Design a protein. Structure first.
Length: 211
């Protein structure tokens, strides 16, 4: 398909805000699972970043983490709702509440494979990492981003679609910096860019949950 936008397909929840806590890996993992459940079951159910932040044991809480290992956690342990376990903007005691969703696993997209990346985005929402530590990235407001990226991949986000404006291909990227950043919380990043690994490294470590 020449264009994909899951925001228009009733399976993507509103933009959220992680605050200061480095919990973007939990938001990225939650966003990918929520959409998968929407596509697979025609059921929109908001899931708990907080459970991953408190309970996923390979990550570093508010000092970073792994959405791939978050996927493995949900496949083994299930995940409870956002309503049952709300986000409190800091790591706390790990609670195992009544779980509402599982997944069966996850997959890793090979490094720098934007072609395979597009194939997966046409079917579901994908977790990706970007180089977020730059003034240009933090102050992005609108358009297809063409500023400088950070030096290293350090921020978990999601790709929720792709398209083209004026013949410039782009990815639609969901962030967890609230709706005052970018285009109502989203960024359009160049697609098939001249940066190896994708623009701001978006294709370096892509992964997605398997129902």
């Amino acid at each position: 398909p020449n264009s994909v936008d899951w925001r228009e397909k009733d399976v993507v929840f509103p933009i959220r805000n992680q605050g200061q806590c480095g919990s973007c890996w939990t938001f990225s993992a939650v966003a990918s699972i929520e959409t998968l459940i929407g596509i697979k079951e025609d059921r929109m159910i908001a899931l708990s970043e907080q459970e991953l932040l408190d309970c996923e044991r390979t990550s570093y809480g508010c000092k970073g983490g792994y959405y791939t290992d978050a996927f493995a956690y949900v496949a083994k342990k299930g995940l409870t709702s956002r309503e049952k376990y709300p986000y409190i903007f800091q790591q706390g005691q790990c609670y195992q509440k009544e779980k509402v969703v599982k997944i069966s696993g996850y997959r890793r997209i090979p490094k720098n494979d934007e072609k395979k990346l597009q194939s997966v985005v046409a079917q579901q929402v994908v977790s990706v990492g970007v180089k977020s530590k730059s003034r240009d990235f933090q102050h992005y407001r609108s358009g297809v981003f063409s500023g400088a990226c950070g030096p290293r991949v350090d921020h978990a986000v999601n790709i929720v679609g792709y398209g083209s404006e004026g013949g410039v291909n782009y990815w639609i990227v969901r962030n967890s910096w609230g709706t005052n950043w970018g285009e109502n919380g989203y960024m359009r990043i160049p697609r098939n860019s001249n940066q190896s690994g994708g623009y701001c490294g978006i294709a370096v470590q892509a992964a997605y949950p398997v129902y």
